[PDB]
RNA sequence: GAGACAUGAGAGGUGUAGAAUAAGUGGGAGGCCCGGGCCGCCGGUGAAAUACCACUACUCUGAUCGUUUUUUCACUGACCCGGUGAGGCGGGGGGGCGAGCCCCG
RNA sequence: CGCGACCUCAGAUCAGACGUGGCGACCCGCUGAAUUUAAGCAUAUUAGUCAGCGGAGGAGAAGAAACUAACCAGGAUUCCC
């Protein structure tokens, strides 16, 4: 579920990605930090595959 | 669709104007449009409120609201000086005859008056009706105490049950310096009401006859 | 291993825990760790 | 740190390598038989900070539960009386089946103490869990304070008492306003204190 | 394979006197053509005609490369069935009995 | 084509121990009705009670806050008003 969130974000369709995350793990401030850390990992392999 | 180049890299906010300086790419006069965006709309419904702003823009397209103000407002009249006329003249300047070259839709934004009004549909010729023009009060063309839409004369726009519109303000020879508060009004005057519509921010579109693209969201 | 790894210590799969087990004097280990080392066999290690 | 990594990859029960051993753990427990001697405990992070050590008289027993809910035992699916009482299906057990299976090993074992126990991977149809146990005779665990009290005499049959970790999970009792049905140390003592009438002698 | 899926994308319609229907959200009396333009427009007072600047998207598009859903076929390793005292299962080597099959002597 | 080491299992009238059953007034874990009342009766009530099953001890359970509170704050559990 995490990977597939991670796609949502690629194609940055983030509104859904937050209502998947939080059908997943059930709360929406879990999933908003579920969401934000999942962003920061993205933005990390990106910078790394651009460098 | 848009112009040749067709990119942007800025998300162009609204605290943004920062567009414009080449807008005179070839050597004639571009008609700089002003649009709205709003969206989200149900065709099988009725919406109201429409919009009619003064649109500070000193323009080279221009019309005038002079047509009748019959003997009533003379001293605002005469700092303009119009053609002053009588109502068989009106007959005269209106498309019943077939005198002379003359523009039959030339302005469709007539003065307001309280007389002329009631006897102007019943013996004049229907092309005002035809034309959809009509002496009314959206205009704001009262024109007695002392100068109100008289001199400047904007362009005026609709809001009716359609999508899309462009109307255009003018032109320009200049620079958006005093653009940076002439224009925003759109997404307020939208927003203030009929929240049972569509959102308050999106961009514009200002296609001409060389639409630069300055989608100002 | 990826400890090891990003670490930098040189690691390596041995086939056999009862072999390690025995070296060590018991009956099975899981690993075995090689600190510094006296001067004779620093060239074996500089070779493996 | 090792069995802080080893807490960490337990966490990560969703991942390839996780769900690889689970997967084959569990076809293998399948296929062994219900109640199971385990040499060793497959979890033993888990198992230390539940209580296990490395010690002669620690065993450990591995539990396997038919999952599910629990069924009304009536013949032909006919209570009788009050429609509110017709239920048969959709019934649930009041203890967990880590509890069962708990109260399952110490039944067998007879002669041990259940000290705790923890989960070692499902199923669709089974459950499977670890029942640490403790020999209350070795010397090595009578002869050494700080574990003792579980030789004494009155922490026979916990699991069927209820005070484990499972079965006290299932009694529901803590501090606060979540737990009053509880607040004389249990639910029954509860109910008896506040449905007993106090006729004082000068009323 | 199929399915709306990322998407690109040629392509518009008439009750009709119309220089096709001069049609869609555009409308300058011409930007611009050579210091000329042009299907037409204040000149069927014209479906609001529209000589022009087709920004909403017009019966809207064959397909592109991606993520997503379903159908068929096949595999076995979970799972199931049967048999057995778990008795010769799968692949592979020679002279060869016979086709003489075969460069053919 | 043997010899070891470990792992996972098995056997033993192997050496030494331990459990089983009873009682059940109080305690703990489950399971758990219907009579009754509602002037009928189905939710409700009876009642988480009787019956049923398991496990104890001289007591048991509980117990040193993932607590109460909203105050100038209190401070494990149990019992009484
Ligand atoms: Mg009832
Ligand atoms: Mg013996
Ligand atoms: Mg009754
Ligand atoms: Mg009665
Ligand atoms: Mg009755
Ligand atoms: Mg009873
Ligand atoms: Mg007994
Ligand atoms: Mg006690
Ligand atoms: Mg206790």
Known sequence: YERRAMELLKVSKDKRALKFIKKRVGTHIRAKRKREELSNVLAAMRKAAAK | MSSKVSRDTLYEAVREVLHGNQRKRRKFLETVELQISLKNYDPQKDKRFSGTVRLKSTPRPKFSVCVLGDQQHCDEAKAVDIPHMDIEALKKLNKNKKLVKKLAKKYDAFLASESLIKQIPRILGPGLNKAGKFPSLLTHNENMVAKVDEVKSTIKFQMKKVLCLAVAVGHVKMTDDELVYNIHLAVNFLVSLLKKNWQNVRALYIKSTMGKPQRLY | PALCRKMGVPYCIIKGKARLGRLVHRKTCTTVAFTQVNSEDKGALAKL | ????????????????????????????????????????????????????????????????????????????????????????????????????????????????????????????????????LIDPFHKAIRRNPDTQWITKPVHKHREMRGLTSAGRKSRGLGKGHKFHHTIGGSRRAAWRRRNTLQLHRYR
């Open chain 4, 1 to 132: 740190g090792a069995y802080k990594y080893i807490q960490e990859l337990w966490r990560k029960k969703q991942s390839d390598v996780m769900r690889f051993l689970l997967r084959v753990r569990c076809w293998q427990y399948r296929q062994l038989s219900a109640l199971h001697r385990a040499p060793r405990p497959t979890r033993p992070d888990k198992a230390r900070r539940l209580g296990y050590k490395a010690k002669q008289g620690y065993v450990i027993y591995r539990i396997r539960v038919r999952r599910g809910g629990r069924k009304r035992p009536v013949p032909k699916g006919a209570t009788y009386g009050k429609p509110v009482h017709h239920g048969v299906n959709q019934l649930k057990f009041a203890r967990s089946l880590q509890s069962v299976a708990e109260e399952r090993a110490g039944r067998h074992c007879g002669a041990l103490r259940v000290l705790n126990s923890y989960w070692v991977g499902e199923d669709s149809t089974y459950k499977f869990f670890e029942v640490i």
